[model samples]
Structures are given as structure tokens and as C-alpha cells.
Target chain A: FVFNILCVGETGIGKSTLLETLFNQKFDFSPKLKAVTYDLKEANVKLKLTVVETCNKENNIKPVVDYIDNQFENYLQEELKMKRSMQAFHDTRVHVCLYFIAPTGHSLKSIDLVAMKKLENKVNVIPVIAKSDTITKSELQKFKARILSEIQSNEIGIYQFPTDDEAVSETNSVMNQHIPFAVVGSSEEVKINGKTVRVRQYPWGSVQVENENHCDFVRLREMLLRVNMEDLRERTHGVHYETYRRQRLIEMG
Target chain B: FVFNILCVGETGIGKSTLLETLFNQKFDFKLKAVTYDLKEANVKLKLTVVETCENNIKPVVDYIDNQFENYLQEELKMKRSMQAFHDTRVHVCLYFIAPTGHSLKSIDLVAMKKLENKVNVIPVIAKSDTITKSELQKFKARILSEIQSNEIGIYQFPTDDEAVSETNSVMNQHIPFAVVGSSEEVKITVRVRQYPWGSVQVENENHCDFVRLREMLLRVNMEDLRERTHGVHYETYRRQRLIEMG
Candidate 1:
């Protein structure tokens, strides 16, 4: 399976650190716009994971939109070519984007609103609260509610979790409570109770990154790769990519 | 010494419960505006606390200004009659910051900014038991930084002399004091809030800053609050009114 994930956030929001933790490896994230490909195997399945990185600067997301459009254009050009081989074509369209929001304990910033607005139509934007350990559980709840309210009020589009099977829908409803998943990222590993776990140490308490009680990192991982990977790819090619191709065809005509 | 305090916060912030815990006495605080007077350790306190209706800040500011205006009017009459002036000016405002464990709310910022100059605004984090110690510390830092950045002049505890310098410094650092208030008691004198999971002691210093808040508001700085109102806040209002009249 091939998956393209675009990571976007301002600087010091721990995007690279989170990617390292998610993939469980040290990433060579340069201070420039680029993409890194990883052949990841989890649960006996192989995935060609291509992650696009952005320089964590201000909220000019034109480059991000242009990158997504560029991929669709490449695929469309290959489809039109007579010399094209069926097996040699690569689907490089962005499947989903992980939008990291800073833990400001306030509503979404103007920059976040502008960036997410631009990126939502081009890719499935999953807003994640970065460094959520800095806020209280009560505050985190309210912050999530406020963010969703702002998203709705501002008419910003984000990826909605799909439900179908009875058991899957039950968990999806529960997972919907964790919308805009508040996440904590760490690359540090520690052994406690003879089990090595990814954790972030604090003076007060040790935050287990994968622990359901601590954060939504595990839920994010489950929803992104385990459950919604195919859905994201299908929607990307069917919806986002189709929209771009239609517009492009119209412009050419 | 007679001191007047006006408590202001949003609804369900435990303002009346905190007052019940502060005085350790349950007085009749019905819906409408009510002032409860109590004498504690040779000091008389007039506490008037209530929630605002529909985030309307105009009334709270107008009420504070009306007190100042009333006092100014009395001062003008006292000069002609040589009579004693009755003081009803609010000394300190216990501005309850809801226990969101996040930054201050928009209403909180606007209300506090309006009340800061009118009264000695002391921001307190009500229902502190909802958050952990680490969360409380970070929340306090966030609130203080926001207040500073917005230039909201909350009450600053003084460190005048050696006797109170250390204690006052520690108390001042505990501004926006995270407090859990409950008049319910396990014993006759001990107050504790019972919960299904656990219980929170109202007077526990490690748990919350209820003790520190009570100490500063009633015991130590009561006189200083009165003096600040008479000399500083009231005087500011007095000068402004005189200038407007001229």
C-alpha cells in the first residue's frame, strides 16, 4: 500500500519529534521543504509511506496546495500519455495531512484558520493538539470543544471519521469524542514493569505517549493507519484529486 | 476596621460556596444583590458577591463607579455640614477565574480589565480541585502572563516591612490562587468536599490556596485593602470627578 502524509505546523510544535515517535525511528528532517519515503511494516502489512515536510514558518500554505496539485497533475499527465505503463505509475497524491495545533489554551489562531482553510480542500486535514500535556484534562476537553466550535463556525473542512460496521461504529463514536486529538509526542523510551514504553518524563508525572489515559497518540495511530488508511486514499483520489483534475481539464479546454 | 469586598465571576463558579468556606458560616445569600456583614477577629467585613447576568459587564463597572460617585457626593456634602461620611466603597474585588485550567476567558479578561481600576481586583481560580498541581501551576503562569501582556492591573500584594515580606511574597506569587471551596464539613471545624473517587480538603494548603486566600483577604491585608481604597482607588475617582465637575 502507498500512503502520502503531509505534516504542517509552526516551528517548535514538535512535528518532527512526533513523526519520529510515530514511526519509531530517527528522521532526517532538514530545515527545508522536502519529502522522506519510508517502507514501514506493521501488522504484517507493508506500506510505502511518503511524508512531505514543510519549513515551520508563517501561514503561507500556497506551497502546500501547489504540491498537492502538482502530484495530481503528474498523475493526470501520465494517464493521458500513450507510452505509459500500467504497473509503472505511482499514486503520489497526498492521502492526509496532520495539522499540529499549538497548546495555546485558547481558540485557533488566525494563522491556523488560514492554513487549515487552504489545506482542507486539497488534503484530509486532521487537526492534532501538539504538546497537550501542558494543559489540564478539563482544559483539554474545553479546548477540543472550542476548536471544533471554531471549525464549524468558520466553515473549515476537516476529515470526518466514517462509520459502517456495528462494532467499528461503536468505537468510532467514542473516538469522535477525541476529535482534534490532543497528543503528546516523545522519542524517549523507558523500562518500567519490565516493559519498554515511549514516555515523556516530567517532575510531577511520567506521560506514557501510547497510553490511552495519557493522550490520543494511540487513537491517532489506529485511526490513521489501521482503520482509515484506505478510506483516506480513496477519498483523496476520488474527491480531492478528482476536483483538481476536473478544474484542470476545464482550464485546458 | 470595616472592609467591603465584591465577588464577581460567571455562573456556577462556586462564588457563594467559596464565601461560605471563607467565613466558615452559611449566611442567607439569596438570588438578587445582598451584602453580608461579619466580624472576624476584631474586623468587620462587608462581602457583596454575585454572578453577572448574561456577560453584561456594564452593570458591574457601573455599580463600582456608582459607589465611588456616591462617596464623592457625600464628600461634597460633608464639607458644608462638617459631618462624618459613611463609607460603602468596595475595598477588594475577588474576581473568580473559572477553573477552566486554561487561559482566562474572554469575559474574564474584559470584566477584570474594567474592574481593575475600580477596585483592588484579586483574581482567584475557583474549583481548583478539578485540576492537578502541575496543571494548576501552568494555568496560573498562563493567566498571569496574559494578564500582564494585556496590561490588566490586578491587585499586587505589598512587601512593606520585614515581618510580612516573606509571607507576602509567597502569597503574591500565588495570585489567581487556585482554591476549592466547600462549606460541607466532615467534622465540626474541618471542611472537606466529598466525591465518589476521593475527597478534597478545603483548607489544605497543598491541595489549594484557600488558606492563603483567606489569610490575605481577611486576616493580614484587610487593613491595607481599606487603606488602598480610601487613599488610592477612591482618591483616583475623587480627582476624576472633581476635574469633570470643573
Candidate 2:
């Protein structure tokens, strides 16, 4: 199964390092590359990750919407071929948009509201709280609550975890508690109980990335890779891409 | 011997302390009742320390000139009890200018101009060391220009070769002499003003103008003050009054 995901957020919110810990020798954080696609072959699954890292300098949010809409436009404009019509532009569409919100204990910024709401309809916009270790646990909880309330009142739609028939598992419920997943990402590893675990070392102690009691990094990775991987691809095609198609046809009519 | 000086300067520039240090005694500094007399040995010294805090010097100057007019009227009309009309006249007027790293303020310019021909208005900078050497130089140069250009006559140092066994040329630079002082709140010995970290000695020659101010006011220009008062200022007044009466 091939799963293509798009990572989006403002620069310096640890998006690069998060994605680096996700899969890299390094990272990708920008404002203007149309989409950066990387083909990765996992043990049982094949993955194509497309990242729309940058936008134009002024009013960058408009370009993010353009990036997602243009993918459908390109795929729809492609001539009817037995091979290409089956999977050309549809494959190119952004699957999961991991919206990185900075750990600024204040409420949501205008850019976050505009970009997330605009891209939420076109792709599965999963709001991720980036570099969250900066805030204390209480501050992080408060910041997340403020962000959640702002998202609701402002009508900013982030990705909703599908419950329909499948039971919401313990992992699912734990992940749901971390609405905008407060994650700490690092590529560095430390020795813990004879096991080499990825951790961010402080002057005091080390924060294990895979440690569930520490952060939601493991859960976020699990959700994208296993829990909601199929759902992301399905939503992008069935709902988001379908919405774009209908809108295009209506505009044409 | 009796010496009468009228001290003039703005408040908080140590005018009171300067006057206090002159005799170095307890005294009231307001212009309301400004007759501070000290009897040190045979010489009787009288000081009229006028404050310019309120800037209402019109009445102050008018009141001073009215006294001069009354004295002149008594003298020219009658022989005036001819002994020495000197006690009634202000021999030296100390016009204390604050060291603001700038030229004299409008207060100094106006007050000094009015009192110039009437008394030997010796303009001295109240607090000197607050400014740097170069800043003081620039400020003095600006003051000299402003004084000359505006035609406000202040007390003159002996520029001519007529008198002065010692050259008054060096004394010329000290005109409108910078006057700095003591806060009277030091730790122990040596009349010093204490700071948070350091201390400023009042009589210390390197710190303030107490030395030069004492020299002229009490010694250097002492005889010259009598000459200016009796010979120059009083004569000028008598002439002006005679002309006005005629």
C-alpha cells in the first residue's frame, strides 16, 4: 500500500527535526517548493511522502491552498489514458497535512487558523504541537485547551479520527487526548536500561521520544503509519478530492 | 570693615551652601529676608543671597534699584551725612550660573543684564565639575559670546595693565567662575559629599570652585569690589539719576 503525506506549518516549529525523526538523514522546512516527494519502501508498506514546505513571501496562506487545489487541477487536466487516468493526479494529491503549531502558550495565530481551515477540506489536516518540551506540563495542557477552544469557536477544522464501526482502541483514545499532539522530536539516541532509545537530553535528564508518559511522539508516528494511515489516504480520495472535483465541475458548469 | 555682597543664582545649585560656605555658617537663603551678616574679627561681612527659583525677579530688582534711588536722592540733594554711603550699596553681586554644559539660561541673561550696571554682577557657574573639561570650555566660550553679543555687562577682571601686581589674565578665564560644592553628608573627616560609592570633598581644589570663589569674593577682588561699588556703580547711578531728575 502506497501512502503519500504532506507536512505543513510555519518554519522553525521543529517540523524539519520532527520529520527528520519521522524518516530522515536530515529535514525539509520551506515556504515555496510546490511539493517535495520522497519514495520510501518500508518492510510491508510502500510510501510516497509529498511535502508542500513553502509559499510565496506575502500572504503565504493563499499559496498553500493553491498547492493542494493545483494538484487536483493537474490530475483532472491530464488527458485520458488507460494507465495515467487510473492514478496520475489522484496519487499526487496531498494525503495527510501535519499542521505544526508552535509551543507558544498563547492561543492560535491567524496564519494557523487560515492555513488549517483552508487545507482541512482538501487534505487530512492533523494539527501537531511542535517543540512542545519548551512549555511546562501544566502550561502545555492549558495551551492545548486554548488551541482546541480557538479551533472550535473559529470553525478551524483539523483532521477528525474516524470511529464509524471500528472500536476506538486504547491507543486511539490516548492519541485523542493529545488533540494537537505535543511532540518532542530528536534523532539523537541515549542508552536506557541497555536499550538505545531516541531522546532529547537536557541539563537535568533525557526525554525519550518513544516514551508514552513523556510525549505523544510515538502515538503520532503510530497513528500516521498504522492507526489512520489508510483512513488518511481514503479521506483525501473519497472526501477532499471528491469535494475538489465537484467544485471544479460546478465552476466549469 | 564692612563688605556687602548680593548673591544671585537658581536653587539646588548649592547657592545656599555656597553662601553657607562663604561664612560657613547657618543662614536662611530666601530673598524675602536675605540679610546674612557675619562678624569675623573686625571685618563685618553682609550677604544678600537672592534665589531665582520662582523666576519673579522683576520685583527683586525693582526693590534693589529703589533703594539705590533713595540713597542717591539723599546724597545729591543734600551732602547726605557724607561719611561713607558704601554700607548702603551692594559691593559685589555673585551671579551663580549652573553648569548645564550650555550657555547661560534666559534667567541668568535677563537678571545679570538688569543688575550689571547697578552692581558688579560677577557671574559664576554654580556646579562646575558635573561637566567635562571640554564641555566646560565650550560652555564658557558660548557664555562669553552671548554676554558680549547681548551687551550685558558683567564684572570685569583687570584686563588693562593699570593695576594688579599679579596678572588678572589667568583670573579672566575664571570669570563666570564655575562654583561646585559639598553635600555636607560625608562619613568622617575632610568636608566631603558622600555618594553611593564615592565622595566629593568640598574644599578640595580639584573637585569644585570653592577655592577660586573664596579668593575673589574674600581676597583677590575684595578691594576691586569696593572700587567698583563706590567708584563705578555708584557714580554711574548718580549720573543716571541726575540726568533723569534734570
Candidate 3:
């Protein structure tokens, strides 16, 4: 199956680098390419990852909105427009929207709020803290708490994780706590324990970008394409696109 | 020369311990004693240190304003208004800036400007041990520039740099003097607030600007600070007062 994700954030917030790290390849951010797709064979699924990212303030939300709506354009027939359909995931609707929050150890900027709020009606918006290596652990905790509270106060909806059976119950709550994952991305390689790792090399100690001890990059990969991909795809189509279709139909009526 | 220094700063910024270190006495901040006297006999001058330790600068400045106005009223009724006004007005208002690498906060600027008209406003960035020397210098420059550009009239010393004698050349910097204040002394140990890593000595010149600040306020330029309050600031206050009274 294919997972289509649109990335939105301010320029120079490491969106390109994060996309590169996630796919293990260079991403040309130039608009001439427009979009890029990568095929990943994970343990649970063989997923096609298609990315559409924007760094423009004027054209921020419109392109993603157009791309998402156009996916279901041919599928939503006259009769299908009124009903909220969970089966529309058969098309290339944007399965998830990755919104990057700059790691300034504070809440989301109003611009992030605007973009995320605008996308909440279309896709599952997940906020990620970019460049997590800038702050200490204590400060990161405080910053994450502040971001969570401020987003709640600003009334922005982020993707929520669903709970599970007794075997994975306690481990699942830990993943919930990692919401708005404090993530660091790296394209550079460093050797630790005689094995090459994608890591951020600081004089103090190198932080493995995919290491759960340092950041939530690992957990993000887990939630996105692994465990929650189906849930997010269902959410994008059944809850959001269904509402959008219903609104358009009523407006037509 | 009875100089009154009013200490104002945020909580946990070391206003209480700094006062203790300055007066060379263990000042109890809780009796909330209105004022204290520091007597000097080197030339028979008595210095009075009045402290308002509460973080809210509004009430402290209001208290000083009320004290100045009441003294002015008493002086006008008794026929010696100007002399009593000069004698009773606050001499140096010490508004403590926290020693952070950040620029001067808007709140500090507002409070200092509020009390500057009635006293010789001296900006001292307190608790300097936490920041690096380079960061402190940059922060000081930003603070001074912001103060000047914002039109806050901090008391300026004479600027004949070459003419200044070697003894007083240290006070030539326009930067807010960063200070660490402490009163803990053990078995002839220097005054320091001890931490597990190391102790921050209160009077070490390398550690902070406490001695230079003390020298400026209590010794070399004490008379100038008082005269500024009397000459420029209080004169402005009295001119408006008389014109209003007439």
C-alpha cells in the first residue's frame, strides 16, 4: 500500500533533511520536482511513501488541500458525496500530514497553528519537534509540556493514538506521551560499537538519530508507517474527507 | 552625607543577601524593617540605607514618592521646603537587573524609569556568577544601548577618561555592573554563597562587580550621587511642585 504524507513548516526547519533521513536518500527541495516517492519494505507492510512538502508561506496550505481533495475527486460520485465513506482509502488521499515545529523550546507559533488548523479538516495532522538536540532533557520535557498545553489552549487538533490489549497496554501509553515527538534528523554517519549509525556528532557525545534514548525519531517511524498507518488512513478518509465531502454536497444542494 | 539606597529586584535574585553583604550585617528581611542607618566616621558622614525587598517595585517607588511628597509638604509648612526636600528625598535607587545573557527586560526598564525622576537611578545587574564574562559584556552593551535608545536617564559619571586617576579608572564603563552578593563567611573565609560545585565569593573582582559598585555608591562617588538627586532630579520635582502650588 501507499502512504502519502505532506510536510508543512517554515523554511530551514530541517524538513528536507528529515525527509532524507526517513527515506535514507537525498531530497531535492526545489519545486521543479514537486513530489517524491520512496518504496519501503517494513516488517509489517510493503509501503510506498510519497512526500509533498512546502516551504512557502503564501502557498502553504492550498497545495496540500488541493492534492488531498483531488485524490478523492473521481471517487466521490454524486451519490457517494453525501455519505461518509471509510472505503475511499482505495485512492491516494493524503494518509498523514507531518507538521514540523521548530525546536525553540516553546509552544507552536501562530503560523503553525493556522496551517495545522486548516489541515485538521483534511488529514491527520501530527506535530513534530524539529532539531531536538538543541535543548537539554529537562528543558525538552518542559518545552513539550508547554507545546501540548498551548496547542490545547489554541484548540489545534493533533493525531491521537488508540489504546490496546493487556500485552502492549503500558508500552502504548509511553508512545502517547511521545506525542509531538521530539525528533532529530541526521544525514551524517558515525561509528558506535563498530557499526555505522546515522547520528548527530557533538563533542560531548554523539546522539543516534534513530535511537529512542536520544529522541523520538524511532517512535515516529513506528507510529507513522508501522502500527498506526491503517488507523491514520481510516481517520483521513472516514472522519475528515467524509466531512469535506458532506460539506461540499450540502453546499451544492 | 546620609545616603539612602533603595534596593529593588525580583525574588531569588539575591536582593536580601546582597543587602546583608553590603551593610556588613545580617539584615533580617522579614521584620520588613522600613529603614536602617550606616554610620561612617572617616569624615563624620552618616549613610542611611533604606530597603524595600518585596519584588513589586510599584509599592516601593510609591512609598519613596509618598515619603518625598510628605517631607515637601512638611517643609513648605515650616518655611524650609527646598533644604528639607533635598534632605528627605531618596538618594540612589538601586534597581537590580538579573545577570542573564538576555537583553534588559521591559519590566526592569519601566520600573527604573518610574523611579529615576525622584532619585539617582543606578542600574546594577545582580548575581553575576552564573554567566560567562563574554556573555556578561555583551549583555551589558545591549542593556546600555537599549537604555540610551529608550531615553531612560541613568546617572552618568564624568567622562574624562584620560584624566581619571588610576584609582577610579575601574568605574569608567557605562555597562551595568554585574554583582554577586553573599554574607556567608567561615573562619576568615571570604563571603560566598557555597554550591556543591564551587563557592561564589561575593567580593572577588574577577567573580563580580560588587566592590566597584560599593566603591561607587558608598565611597568615591557617594557625594555625587547625592548631589545629582538634590541638584537635578529634586530641583525638577520642586519646580513642578512650586508652579502647581502657585
Measured against the true structure, the TM-scores of the candidates, in listed sequence, are 0.58, 0.47, 0.49
Inter-residue clash pairs, candidate 1: none
- Local accuracy by lDDT, each model: 0.75, 0.67, 0.66
Per-model DockQ: 0.04, 0.01, 0.03
Off by over 4 Å in 2: A24-31, A34-36, A42-44, A50-58, A78-90, A191-194, B1-246
Model 1, runs deviating above 4 Å: A1-190, A198-209, A213-217, A244-253, B1-67, B77-90, B93-118, B121-154, B159-166, B173-203, B207-210
Candidate 3 lDDT by residue in tens digits, B126-168? 6666455666778888999899988998776644544444435
Q: Of the candidates shown, which would achieve the greatest TM-score relative to the real structure? A: 1
Highest lDDT: which candidate? Answer: 1
Backbone clashes under 3 angstroms, per model: 0, 7, 0
Q: By descending DockQ, how would the candidates be arranged? A: 1, 3, 2
Q: Residue by residue across A114-172, what tens digits does model 1's lDDT show? A: 88888878889999998776555666788899899999999999987778767588777
Give stretches of model 3 more than 4 Å off: A1-253, B30-33, B39-61, B79-87, B158-167, B186-188
- Candidate 2, residue A67: Cα displacement in angstroms equals 1.5
Model 3: per-residue Cα lDDT over A1-253, one tens digit each: 6577777664545666677777667765434115665556554333333445454444676776777777756556633656657554445567777788866545666667777877877888888887776455766888889888877887887777667656455655677789888877777876778986787543224667777877888877766545577778778768987887887778779
Worst ten in a row by lDDT for model 1 chain A: A48-57
